[PDB]
Every structure is written in C-alpha cells, then in structure tokens.
Amino acid sequence: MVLSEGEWQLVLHVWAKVEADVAGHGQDILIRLFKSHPETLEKFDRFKHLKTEAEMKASEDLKKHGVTVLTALGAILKKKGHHEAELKPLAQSHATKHKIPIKYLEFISEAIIHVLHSRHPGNFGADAQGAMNKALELFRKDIAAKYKELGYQG
C-alpha cells in the first residue's frame, strides 16, 4: 500500500486538529475503544477497574495515557510511511510485553475515525476519512510485519 501525497496532506491536515487538544482526543479515543470493545480494557492493569464512562472521564491517568498513545501515533504519521525506526520499539512492547493482537489495533483505528467525526462534524469528510483509513491501515500492516519479524503471529 502506498498513499498519494494528496492523501498524506489530508492526514496531516486532520492531525493538526488533533494536536490542538491532544488530551481531549486521547481521552475520547480510549473511552470509545473501551466501550465498543470491552475486552481491550482487560489488557490495562491500571485501568480495568474502571467500569463506566463517567469513571473513565474522571481518571487523570487515563487522560495521560491517551496523550502518550497519540504522541507516539502522531510521530509515526508525520513520517509519511517512512516509519520503520519509530515502529520497532512499539512493535516490540506491544507484541512481547503487552501481547496485543493486530485485531485490537483495528479496533482502536475504528475508534480514532469515530472520535474524529464526533470532534470535527464539519471538518472531517469522506476524502479525509478515506485518507486516514489508508494511513492507519498502512500502520497496521507494517506493524503486523514487524511482529512476524520478532517471531510473533499478530
């Protein structure tokens, strides 16, 4: 898979909007993921005690982790597909430490797209969506490759 320059520009255009409230987005994205796919919460020792949306929104630590996740993702997308060095420490931790199947990266991808629509009603069109989808798909495929490289079936 390869994106056009056009597609990458739309991805980065949308990302600047995320970077205006990273905490806000990172918080909503984690919560969306936890709500839609509750089995993902169980992977988080620090958070799995959070039963409901209202509890999740009042956790400062969940908000902080959202910043962590979006910071790393942002550094990756900014590379426009030349992201191998950024991917390695990430593939390493999520494969060997955290034990996250690739299927869960598809779920958080869907969460990101949803939050982007919720947070940017008039901004985020069919085209930007198509671009973000391809960018996230690229990330998922290349991280799946790095899992296999480390000996893991993602």
User: Minimum distance between the CB of residue 26 and ligand HEM, rounded to whole angstroms?
Assistant: 10
The whole-angstrom separation of Cα 105 and Cα 111 is: 10
C-alpha span between 67 and 6 (Å, rounded): 27
Per CB under 6 A, the list member of 30, 31, 40, 154 interacting with ligand HEM is 40
Query: Would the annotation count 13 as a binding residue?
Result: no
With H, G, I as helix, E, B as strand and everything else as coil, classify residue 98.
Answer: coil
Q: Nearer Cβ to ligand HEM, position 108 or 131?
A: 108
Cβ(48)–Cβ(42) below 8 Å: yes
The residues, ordered by sequence, that sit 6+ positions from 57 with a Cβ below 8 Å of its Cβ are 27, 31
Binding of ligand HEM at residue 11 (CB under 6 A)? Answer: no
Residues 66-85 binding ligand HEM (CB under 6 A) are 68-69, 72-73
Among left, alpha and beta (phi > 0; psi -120 to 50; other), residue 125 is beta
The verdict on whether residue 82 carries a ligand-binding annotation is no
Task: Please answer whether residues 28 and 70 qualify as being in contact, where contact means their C-beta atoms are separated by less than 8 angstroms.
Answer: no
Piece in contact with ligand HEM (CB under 6 A), picked from 5-13, 18-26, 65-73, 121-129: 65-73
Q: Is 103 in the site for ligand HEM (CB under 6 A)?
A: no
44 binds ligand HEM (CB under 6 A): yes
* Total residues in contact with ligand HEM, by rule CB under 6 A: 17
| Sole binder of ligand HEM in the list 11, 31, 83, 104 (CB under 6 A) | 104
